[PDB]
């Protein structure tokens, strides 16, 4: 899996993942 | 899975994932 | 897996991973 | 796996990993 | 695995690893 | 594995490793 | 493995290693 | 393995090693 | 000035201040 | 000035201050 | 000035101060 | 000035101060 | 001034002070 | 001034002081 | 002034003082 | 002034003092 992101002063949340099982936030 | 995002001063939330099981936010 | 990110004064959270099992945040 | 990140005064959290098993945060 | 990061006064946490087994934080 | 990092007055934690087995923090 | 790091008054923790077996912190 | 580090009044911990077996901290 | 806020898992940005001079985000 | 905030797993940025002069983010 | 905050696993940045002069982030 | 904070595994930065003069981060 | 804080495995920076004059980070 | 803090494996920096004059970090 | 702190394997820096004059770190 | 601290394998620096005059680190 490749991860390429370009951010600049982001007050917001940037989520990007791949879960095979249960996950909690 | 590839992840390519371009953001700039985003006050909003940017969600992008793939869950196979249960997930909570 | 490759990891390339470019950030600059980001008050927000930047998540980017790949979980095969259960994970909690 | 390659890890290349460019940050500058980031008050936010920058997560980037690859877990094969269970992980907790 | 190569590790190249450029940080400057980062109050946030910068995580970047590759776990084959279970890991806890 | 190569390790090249450039930090300057970082109040945050900078983690960068590669574990084949279990690890705890 | 090469180790090159440049720090200056870092109140934060800078971890950078490569473990083949179990490790605890 | 080469070891080159440049520190100046670092209150934080600077870890950089390569373990083939189990290690505890 | 009083500051009372109640948040719970907010992916969005919550700004609330009072500037008398110029300010940039 | 009083500061009372209640947060729980907030991926977003929570800003709350009072500047009399110029400020940059 | 009183400071009372309750946080729990916050990936986001929580700023809360009062500046009379110029300040940079 | 009183300082009471309750944190638990916070990857984000928690700033809370009161500056009368100029300050830089 | 009273200082009471409760932290547990915090990868983020926790700042809490009161400066009457100029301060740099 | 009273100082009571409870930490456990904190990779982040925990600052808590009261300066009447100029201070540099 | 009373000083009571409880730490356990802290890789981060724990500062807690009260300066009336100028101080440098 | 009373001094009571409990540490265990701390790689980080633990500062706790009270200066009335100028001090350098
Ligand atoms: N969460
Ligand atoms: N959530
Ligand atoms: N979490
Ligand atoms: N956590
Ligand atoms: N943790
Ligand atoms: N830990
Ligand atoms: N540890
Ligand atoms: N340890
Ligand atoms: N910004
Ligand atoms: N910024
Ligand atoms: N900044
Ligand atoms: N900074
Ligand atoms: N700094
Ligand atoms: N510093
Ligand atoms: N310093
Ligand atoms: N110093």
Swiss-Prot record, chains A, B, C, D, E, F, G, H, I, J, K, L, M, N, O, P:
Amyloid fibrils are degraded by insulin-degrading enzyme IDE. The modification Tyrosine amide is found at residue 25. It is found in: Secreted. IAPP is the peptide subunit of amyloid found in pancreatic islets of type 2 diabetic patients and in insulinomas. The mature protein is largely unstructured in the absence of a cognate ligand, and has a strong tendency to form fibrillar aggregates. Homodimerization may be the first step of amyloid formation. Belongs to the calcitonin family. Amylin/IAPP is a glucoregulatory peptide hormone that plays an important role in the regulation of energy homeostasis. Selectively inhibits insulin-stimulated glucose utilization and glycogen deposition in muscle, while not affecting adipocyte glucose metabolism. IAPP function is mediated by the CALCR-RAMPs (AMYRs) receptor complexes. Amylin can also bind CALCR receptor in the absence of RAMPs, although it is more selective for AMYRs. Can form homodimers. Interacts with IDE and INS. Interaction with INS inhibits homodimerization and fibril formation. This is Islet amyloid polypeptide. It comes from Homo sapiens. The lineage of its organism: Eukaryota, Metazoa, Chordata, Craniata, Vertebrata. The gene is IAPP. The chain holds residues 46 to 70 of 89 of the full protein.
């Amino acid at each position: 899996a490749n991860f390429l992101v370009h951010s600049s002063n982001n007050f917001g949340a940037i989520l990007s993942s791949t879960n095979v099982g249960s996950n909690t936030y």
